[PDB]
Design an enzyme around this catalytic site. Structure first.
Site, PDB file in Angstrom:
ATOM      1  N   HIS A   1      -2.556  -3.317  -0.212  1.00  0.00           N
ATOM      2  CA  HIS A   1      -3.431  -2.649  -1.018  1.00  0.00           C
ATOM      3  C   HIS A   1      -4.352  -3.741  -1.752  1.00  0.00           C
ATOM      4  O   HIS A   1      -3.940  -4.560  -2.259  1.00  0.00           O
ATOM      5  CB  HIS A   1      -3.075  -1.684  -1.868  1.00  0.00           C
ATOM      6  CG  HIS A   1      -3.869  -0.709  -2.489  1.00  0.00           C
ATOM      7  ND1 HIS A   1      -3.372   0.155  -3.217  1.00  0.00           N
ATOM      8  CD2 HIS A   1      -5.322  -0.553  -2.144  1.00  0.00           C
ATOM      9  CE1 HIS A   1      -4.427   0.982  -3.768  1.00  0.00           C
ATOM     10  NE2 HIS A   1      -5.506   0.605  -2.775  1.00  0.00           N
TER      11      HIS A   1
ATOM     12  N   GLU B   1     -10.302  -5.242   1.592  1.00  0.00           N
ATOM     13  CA  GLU B   1      -8.925  -5.158   2.037  1.00  0.00           C
ATOM     14  C   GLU B   1      -8.371  -5.350   3.316  1.00  0.00           C
ATOM     15  O   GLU B   1      -7.405  -6.095   3.549  1.00  0.00           O
ATOM     16  CB  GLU B   1      -8.589  -3.422   1.851  1.00  0.00           C
ATOM     17  CG  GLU B   1      -7.069  -3.203   1.795  1.00  0.00           C
ATOM     18  CD  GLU B   1      -6.902  -1.656   1.375  1.00  0.00           C
ATOM     19  OE1 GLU B   1      -7.103  -0.981   2.378  1.00  0.00           O
ATOM     20  OE2 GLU B   1      -6.309  -1.715   0.300  1.00  0.00           O
TER      21      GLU B   1
ATOM     22  N   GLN C   1       0.795  -1.059  -0.087  1.00  0.00           N
ATOM     23  CA  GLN C   1      -0.051   0.088  -0.093  1.00  0.00           C
ATOM     24  C   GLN C   1       0.893   1.303   0.087  1.00  0.00           C
ATOM     25  O   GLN C   1       1.951   1.494   0.864  1.00  0.00           O
ATOM     26  CB  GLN C   1      -1.021   0.091   1.175  1.00  0.00           C
ATOM     27  CG  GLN C   1      -2.251   0.553   1.106  1.00  0.00           C
ATOM     28  CD  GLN C   1      -2.254   1.976   1.247  1.00  0.00           C
ATOM     29  OE1 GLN C   1      -1.228   2.530   1.652  1.00  0.00           O
ATOM     30  NE2 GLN C   1      -3.289   2.831   0.768  1.00  0.00           N
TER      31      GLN C   1
ATOM     32  N   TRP D   1     -11.833  -1.343   6.481  1.00  0.00           N
ATOM     33  CA  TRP D   1     -11.589  -1.410   4.879  1.00  0.00           C
ATOM     34  C   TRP D   1     -12.112  -2.454   4.240  1.00  0.00           C
ATOM     35  O   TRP D   1     -11.343  -2.824   3.375  1.00  0.00           O
ATOM     36  CB  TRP D   1     -10.033  -0.759   4.695  1.00  0.00           C
ATOM     37  CG  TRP D   1      -9.857   0.527   5.373  1.00  0.00           C
ATOM     38  CD1 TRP D   1      -8.876   0.853   6.089  1.00  0.00           C
ATOM     39  CD2 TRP D   1     -10.488   1.652   5.005  1.00  0.00           C
ATOM     40  NE1 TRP D   1      -8.947   2.168   6.575  1.00  0.00           N
ATOM     41  CE2 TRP D   1      -9.929   2.774   5.803  1.00  0.00           C
ATOM     42  CE3 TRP D   1     -11.691   1.933   4.206  1.00  0.00           C
ATOM     43  CZ2 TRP D   1     -10.695   3.950   5.538  1.00  0.00           C
ATOM     44  CZ3 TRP D   1     -12.174   3.306   4.083  1.00  0.00           C
ATOM     45  CH2 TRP D   1     -11.556   4.351   4.681  1.00  0.00           C
TER      46      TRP D   1
ATOM     47  N   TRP E   1      -3.175   5.394  -8.900  1.00  0.00           N
ATOM     48  CA  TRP E   1      -4.481   5.552  -8.461  1.00  0.00           C
ATOM     49  C   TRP E   1      -5.005   6.658  -9.386  1.00  0.00           C
ATOM     50  O   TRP E   1      -4.419   7.849  -9.808  1.00  0.00           O
ATOM     51  CB  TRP E   1      -4.540   6.093  -7.051  1.00  0.00           C
ATOM     52  CG  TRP E   1      -4.135   5.106  -5.971  1.00  0.00           C
ATOM     53  CD1 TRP E   1      -3.280   4.168  -6.372  1.00  0.00           C
ATOM     54  CD2 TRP E   1      -4.329   5.288  -4.571  1.00  0.00           C
ATOM     55  NE1 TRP E   1      -2.708   3.611  -4.980  1.00  0.00           N
ATOM     56  CE2 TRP E   1      -3.229   4.190  -4.079  1.00  0.00           C
ATOM     57  CE3 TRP E   1      -4.639   6.099  -3.726  1.00  0.00           C
ATOM     58  CZ2 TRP E   1      -3.253   4.047  -2.829  1.00  0.00           C
ATOM     59  CZ3 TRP E   1      -4.807   6.041  -2.365  1.00  0.00           C
ATOM     60  CH2 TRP E   1      -3.807   4.977  -1.854  1.00  0.00           C
TER      61      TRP E   1
HETATM   62  O1  LIG Z   1     -19.782   1.813  -7.395  1.00  0.00           O
HETATM   63  C1  LIG Z   1     -18.954   1.034  -7.524  1.00  0.00           C
HETATM   64  C2  LIG Z   1     -18.063   0.721  -6.347  1.00  0.00           C
HETATM   65  C3  LIG Z   1     -16.878  -0.121  -6.603  1.00  0.00           C
HETATM   66  N1  LIG Z   1     -16.504  -0.553  -7.787  1.00  0.00           N
HETATM   67  C4  LIG Z   1     -15.409  -1.576  -8.064  1.00  0.00           C
HETATM   68  O2  LIG Z   1     -14.784  -1.819  -6.847  1.00  0.00           O
HETATM   69  C5  LIG Z   1     -13.596  -1.440  -6.581  1.00  0.00           C
HETATM   70  C6  LIG Z   1     -13.115  -0.717  -5.565  1.00  0.00           C
HETATM   71  O3  LIG Z   1     -13.774   0.523  -5.103  1.00  0.00           O
HETATM   72  P1  LIG Z   1     -13.042   1.742  -4.702  1.00  0.00           P
HETATM   73  O4  LIG Z   1     -12.061   1.691  -5.673  1.00  0.00           O
HETATM   74  O5  LIG Z   1     -14.126   2.780  -4.926  1.00  0.00           O
HETATM   75  O6  LIG Z   1     -12.238   1.536  -3.483  1.00  0.00           O
HETATM   76  P2  LIG Z   1     -11.023   2.741  -3.345  1.00  0.00           P
HETATM   77  O7  LIG Z   1      -9.969   2.384  -3.691  1.00  0.00           O
HETATM   78  O8  LIG Z   1     -11.513   4.155  -3.337  1.00  0.00           O
HETATM   79  O9  LIG Z   1     -10.932   2.565  -1.829  1.00  0.00           O
HETATM   80  C7  LIG Z   1     -13.453  -0.234  -7.750  1.00  0.00           C
HETATM   81  O10 LIG Z   1     -12.024   0.050  -8.195  1.00  0.00           O
HETATM   82  C8  LIG Z   1     -14.158  -1.006  -8.782  1.00  0.00           C
HETATM   83  O11 LIG Z   1     -13.652  -1.709  -9.638  1.00  0.00           O
HETATM   84  C9  LIG Z   1     -17.416  -0.299  -8.681  1.00  0.00           C
HETATM   85  O12 LIG Z   1     -17.354  -0.766 -10.089  1.00  0.00           O
HETATM   86  N2  LIG Z   1     -18.419   0.516  -8.779  1.00  0.00           N
END
Ligand SMILES: O=c1ccn([C@@H]2O[C@H](COP(=O)(O)OP(=O)(O)O)[C@@H](O)[C@H]2O)c(=O)[nH]1
Ligand SMILES: [Mn+2]
Length: 284
Positions: free
Chosen positions: A199, A236, A166, A233, A275
């Protein structure tokens, strides 16, 4: 026969951790000989899969950039299969794939709650592994769609079970790690425990290993739901618990999934993936 010394030169990056206590290499820019690995894996005719979910606004916002960059940077020179799970196959962006790239799209049920969308991936990925992925690839990577490949992300990242360091905590003491700290959760990791904070944006390995990763994480998710609790989280937190009990055979440096919003410290020599959106670390 492939030897660790045939491709891994940890001494090239002396200022960072290049190998874990359990002897798994931590791959950083400059420590790998991709040419040697490319030739090695090419001779075995390996295929690599990559699963990515895009539900809701995520499709329009990140799917195209994710795929276009993946096409250009992911396992170049090797057969690659993109498994695209969307809730609305109609909003799908249309892109041209290059040599050795192909894809398969699946329409899935959309969870209403975003956290549920994130966690259910563990369930979905497992089902697909058993149904077809185990028969189609040698290695599999499961990734968030809200990221973009910035440079070559190749065979140097292949391993039986692969984890991603991460970006925020790679230099932190484990007690500062944002592990799930409540004993009521299946993702619970006691203070004074832990190797690294991984991560959930990127993880992979052989279909068998990924199956176990996803099955165990999803079971923990289900347990928490029945115990009226949800890991800090989500998937994760469970992923970190899993990797603590089942050490990964390879770890990718934060260079493989970097957050530009915390800048670019000396240790990040060549970003392979970044990201897409700035994310806070709120606690209050
Ligand atoms: O409404 C949503 C919420 C999540 N995702 C999928 O789930 C993953 C994890 O969510 P998110 O990325 O938002 O987590 P973060 O990295 O922001 O903590 C995303 O990357 C997408 O692939 C999606 O397709 N639609
Ligand atoms: Mn994400």
């Amino acid at each position: 026969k492939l030897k660790l010394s045939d491709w891994f030169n940890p001494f090239k990056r002396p200022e960072v951790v290049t190998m874990t206590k359990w002897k798994a290499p931590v791959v950083w820019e400059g420590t790998y000989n991709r040419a040697v690995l490319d030739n090695y894996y090419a001779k075995q005719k390996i295929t690599v899969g990559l699963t990515v979910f895009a539900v809701g606004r995520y499709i329009e916002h990140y799917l195209e950039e994710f795929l276009t960059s993946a096409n250009k940077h992911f396992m170049v020179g090797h057969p690659v299969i993109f498994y695209i799970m969307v809730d609305d196959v109609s909003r799908m962006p249309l892109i041209e794939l290059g040599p050795l790239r192909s894809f398969k799209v699946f329409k899935i049920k959309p969870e209403k709650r975003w956290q549920d969308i994130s966690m259910m991936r563990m369930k979905t990925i497992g089902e697909h592994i058993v149904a077809h992925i185990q028969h189609e690839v040698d290695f599999l990577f499961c990734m968030d769609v809200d990221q973009v490949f910035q440079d070559k992300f190749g065979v140097e990242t292949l391993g039986e079970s692969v984890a991603q360091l991460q970006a925020w905590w790679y230099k932190a003491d484990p007690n500062d790690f944002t592990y799930e700290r409540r004993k009521e959760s299946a993702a619970y990791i006691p203070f004074g425990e832990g190797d690294f904070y991984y991560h959930a944006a990127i993880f992979g390995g052989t279909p068998t290993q990924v199956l176990n990763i996803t099955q165990e994480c999803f079971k923990g998710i289900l347990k928490d739901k029945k115990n009226d609790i949800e890991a800090q989280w989500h998937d994760e937190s469970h992923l970190n618990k899993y990797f603590l009990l089942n050490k990964p055979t390879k770890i990718l440096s934060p260079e493989y999934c970097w957050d530009y919003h915390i800048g670019l410290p000396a240790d990040i020599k060549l970003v392979k993936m970044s990201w897409q959106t700035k994310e806070y670390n709120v606690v209050r």
